[PDB]
């Protein structure tokens, strides 16, 4: 496999693409919601899927984010996603001010 410099960097990427499993765990996420959902109302219940569905939404939501972030990052002469790279992306999409 050639040498070692930036060897995995592109490798993991590819394997992750071929797959289609959830990027983030499905146990911490499950409480995260239960916990905030309480603050806006009491005595809450949850459909098995409802979360499954959120996970799907969210994950997908972030990737998408990163996907631009990357571009921005490239624009900059950089291969590094940065704390702001996040902001511009959002700002111009418009949720971020």
């Amino acid at each position: 496999h050639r040498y070692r410099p930036g060897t995995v960097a592109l490798r993991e990427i590819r394997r992750y693409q071929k797959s289609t499993e959830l990027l983030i765990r499905k146990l911490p996420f499950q409480r995260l919601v239960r916990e905030i959902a309480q603050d806006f109302k009491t005595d809450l219940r949850f459909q098995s899927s409802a979360v499954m569905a959120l996970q799907e939404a969210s994950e997908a939501y972030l990737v998408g984010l990163f996907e631009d972030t990357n571009l921005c990052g490239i624009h900059a002469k950089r291969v590094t996603i940065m704390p702001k790279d996040i902001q511009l992306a959002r700002r111009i999409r418009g949720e971020r001010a």
Binding site: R34, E35, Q38, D39, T42, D43, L44
Partner: protein
């Protein structure tokens, strides 16, 4: 693969201030180092300038770091008490105890002859060590293997030789052999004698064994249930000749018991388990097969019995599914409770013939399991006030067969008595606050209001129940009852006080404390157990905890430490499912219950671990029933729940080719009939059929031998008769001595006597069988077997030549002297003629680098060597 550091064992001083620096350890400390990829046994006292940069530097440095500070906390500080000195030293003591047991070997896995750099080949054994799993078994040569553990090697040979594999089992598939009621205890129970309720149990299992039906063992919690299966396994093996690899699945908690329970009640069948991970996975397969891979299902077969944890079933469902099994054992088979289980249809795929569950699971709680058990043992086979008689007419008549119900009324006559007392504890101060406020969101939302939301139902019917007696199970409880703002007395007092149960327990505990009873605490919740972990240490009572979070090795150490004759700790705390998991406690008398275990019967076994056949101190049980709470009601439902509790044709030429070689190798082979058949050498035929063929084969051998001798004998007389006639002429001068004919009788006679030609015959199979070769070795070995037997019996090797002189072998490559011959003979006496690697490798012989099978002597040289010695000392060359 390199010589690098693996671990730390021992630390000591190297040489004759306030804190030792690393230099001090380097110039004043010697440390025992275990090397990488190498057993424990080769450990070296080495420093840093001694070895230099070696791969692996990390563990010593830290361990030295641990060492430096350790030195400051035993001798170099006055805040240290009496007790820390006890622990800081103690560690040294235990750290070595877990290191010592690796030196003792526990099983030899296989034997490989591998070559060395001096051109030599030496035998090595794959050695397995004590209380460790199949990994890191490294090869060690045989020289010292028997020099430290002779017993292992003796047994190592025995299994390989004891041809009793699943290769010869009787065809009773179609139909069975009529079976017999046993009176006596089978000559296969070395562990002892059982009683009058362990042999009959066995006679039913084996009794419906011959029906083609499977059965349920439903006896009390510990009526030698395990002995009944092991003996059941033993008598189905030397009764109906079943070598059929029996599969047994037991709990990860209860197997170590079983092994010893299997290796002490029945020596002769070996018991190889399944308890590893990745590496093991391979070693199991190393011995699980013969000759690497195998066409079809032609595995030669190297086990019968196994033990499997419930994990491992499901992780590798597939490989067992393929291999056939016809007998099943399982431990505490209440698992198959629902008919939607994963192991519930996992077990059904394993081609099987008979099953065997053995648990005391009550079978009226739900009718599901009652049916599930019946559906599982027998796939296919399956109220009203006035039809109930009609109903149990159907249920009693059908259910019984595959069922066993039998009371203690046995072995309990010796064992000291059983007893249980309830406890009515009423509520406290801070208690009502959280018995009252919690059933609303008044002050439950003021303090910890964010969490209120999720626990709100938890707290109602599956907490209040659990958080009724003790409110200390959340956050805003600890300072609630402590009325002040470090105090040590108050914390102890403040915690004992809040609960009705804590005080009641503290006083009873004290009450028996001075009288002398060992007390048990079974709590439902993990944390309660830390809670107490925190209090009892403080007030100085020696204990250990028994949770759901502990390595098999660590679990095992303490359980034994506890049942030993002189153990200080009379306090031991356990779990409901984790506590009653398995095991037994035989020293313990008292057991106390904090809260009922949301159900009837989880407690009944929970006391079963302590109340067993052994206990000689009666028994004592306390149940802390909360008053004016929610504990009460379940207790009543619990009651509702437990209301009901109910000839091979002839021998062909190839065998005749098989038998002839075996005689040259072993001599009379009539005694050894089965051992050869078990392994490749012989087909399965009745004992006589071979024995008669063995005898006529020599009978054919001698007749040809004599007939030939007679004929030459008759001619030889005729030639000498002529020979004398010439002799008269020779001294008379008619023919002169220095001018006598080319051909004349003297020459004819000479060639005739010096006749050299093998003697031959047929035997309805072989071509031109050697008549003399067979007769000569049969007798010579008979003689050597006879003399050493009657003078050197107890120890073979002492065998001596004494004066008698057999030829010197000057020019052979290696040292050859009379002692070497002494062993050479014993070697065949032990292994047979013609197998010489066997003889050369043997640790006992000591001939290992004097044999070379340009280097002499090789295989024929020895072959030449024995025939000459054996004839020589009987006087054969006469």
């Amino acid at each position: 693969d390199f010589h690098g550091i693996d671990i730390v064992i021992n630390h000591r001083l190297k040489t004759s201030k306030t804190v030792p620096d690393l230099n001090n350890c380097k110039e004043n400390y010697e440390f025992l180092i275990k090397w990488t990829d190498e057993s424990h046994l080769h450990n070296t006292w080495e420093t840093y300038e001694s070895i230099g940069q070696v791969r692996g530097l990390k563990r010593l440095d830290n361990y030295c770091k641990q060492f430096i500070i350790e030195d400051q906390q035993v001798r170099l500080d006055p805040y240290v008490t009496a007790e820390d000195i006890e622990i800081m030293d103690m560690e040294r003591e235990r750290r070595l105890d877990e290191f010592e047991e690796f030196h003792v070997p526990e099983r030899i896995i296989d034997s490989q002859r591998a070559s060395l750099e001096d051109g030599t080949s030496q035998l090595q054994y794959l050695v397995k060590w004590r209380r460790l799993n199949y990994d890191e078994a490294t090869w060690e040569n045989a020289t010292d293997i028997v020099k430290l553990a002779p017993e292992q090697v003796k047994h190592f040979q025995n299994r390989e030789n004891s041809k009793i594999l699943p290769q010869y089992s009787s065809n009773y598939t179609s139909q069975r052999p009529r079976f017999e009621k046993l009176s006596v205890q089978p000559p296969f129970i070395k562990g002892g004698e059982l009683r009058d309720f362990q042999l009959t149990g066995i006679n039913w299992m084996a009794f419906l064994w011959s029906k083609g039906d499977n059965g349920i063992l439903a006896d009390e919690m510990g009526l030698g249930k395990t002995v009944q299966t092991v003996a059941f396994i033993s008598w189905l093996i030397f009764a109906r000749r079943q070598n059929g690899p029996h599969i047994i699945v037991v709990p990860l908690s209860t197997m170590p018991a079983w092994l010893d329970t299997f290796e002490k009640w029945a020596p002769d069948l070996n018991c190889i388990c399944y308890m590893g991970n990745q590496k093991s996975r391979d070693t199991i397969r190393e011995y699980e097969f013969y000759t690497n891979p195998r066409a079809k299902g032609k595995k030669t077969m190297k086990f019968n019995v196994l033990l499997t944890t419930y994990e491992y079933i499901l992780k590798d469902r597939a490989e067992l599914g393929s291999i056939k099994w016809q007998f099943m054992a399982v431990d505490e088979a209440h698992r198959l409770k629902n008919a939607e289980s994963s192991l519930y249809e996992s077990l059904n795929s394993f081609k099987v013939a008979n099953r065997m569950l053995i648990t005391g699971t009550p079978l009226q709680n739900n009718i599901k399991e009652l049916a599930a058990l019946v559906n599982f043992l027998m796939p296919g086979r399956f109220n009203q006030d006035e039809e109930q008689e009609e109903y149990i007419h159907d249920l009693h008549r059908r259910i019984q067969p595959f069922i066993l119900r039998r009371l203690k009324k046995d072995v309990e006559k010796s064992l000291p008595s059983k007893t249980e007392r309830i406890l009515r504890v009423e509520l406290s101060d801070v208690q009502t606050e959280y018995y009252k406020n919690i059933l609303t969101k008044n002050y439950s939302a003021l303090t910890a209001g964010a969490k209120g939301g999720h626990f709100s139902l938890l707290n109602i019917m599956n907490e209040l129940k659990k958080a009724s007696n003790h409110p200390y199970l959340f956050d805003n409880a600890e300072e609630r009852v402590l009325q002040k703002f470090m105090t040590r007395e108050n914390v102890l007092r403040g915690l004992i006080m809040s609960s009705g149960k804590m005080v009641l327990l503290d006083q009873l505990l004290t009450r028996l404390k001075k009288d002398g009873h060992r007390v048990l605490i079974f709590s439902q919740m993990v944390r309660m157990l830390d809670i107490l972990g925190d209090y009892l240490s403080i007030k100085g009572i020696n204990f250990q905890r028994l949770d759901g979070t502990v390595p098999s090795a660590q679990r095992r150490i303490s359980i034994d430490h506890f049942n030993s004759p002189d153990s200080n700790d009379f306090v031991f705390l356990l779990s409901t499912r984790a506590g009653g998991l398995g095991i037994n406690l035989m020293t313990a008398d008292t057991v106390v219950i904090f809260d009922s275990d949301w159900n009837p019967q989880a407690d009944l076994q929970a006391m079963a671990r302590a109340h067993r056949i052994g206990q000689k101190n009666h028994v004592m049980v306390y149940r802390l029933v909360s008053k004016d709470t929610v504990e009460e009601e379940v207790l009543e439902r619990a009651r509702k729940k437990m209301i009901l509790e109910y000839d091979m044709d002839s021998i062909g030429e190839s065998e005749v080719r098989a038998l002839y070689k075996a005689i040259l190798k072993f001599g009379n082979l009539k005694e050894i009939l089965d051992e050869l058949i078990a392994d490749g050498t012989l087909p399965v035929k009745s004992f006589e059929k071979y024995g008669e063929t063995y005898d006529e084969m020599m009978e054919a051998a001698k007749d040809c031998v004599h007939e030939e001798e007679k004929n030459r004998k008759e001619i030889l007389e005729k030639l000498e008769k002529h020979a004398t006639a010439y002799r008269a002429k020779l001294k008379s001068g008619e023919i002169k001595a220095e001018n006598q004919p080319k051909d004349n009788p003297l020459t004819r006679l000479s060639l005739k006597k010096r006749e050299k030609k093998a003697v031959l015959f047929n035997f309805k199979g072989v071509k031109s069988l050697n008549a003399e070769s067979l007769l000569s070795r049969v007798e010579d070995l008979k003689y050597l077997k006879n003399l050493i037997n009657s003078n050197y019996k107890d120890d073979p090797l002492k065998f001596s030549l004494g004066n008698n002189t057999p030829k010197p072998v000057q020019n052979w490559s290696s040292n050859w002297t009379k002692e070497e011959d002494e062993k050479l003979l014993i070697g065949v006496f032990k292994y047979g003629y013609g197998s010489w690697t066997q003889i050369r490798d043997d640790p006992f012989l000591g001939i290992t680098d004097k044999i070379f099978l340009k280097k002499v002597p090789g295989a024929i040289h020895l072959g030449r060597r024995v025939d000459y010695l054996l004839s020589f000392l009987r006087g054969g060359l006469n």
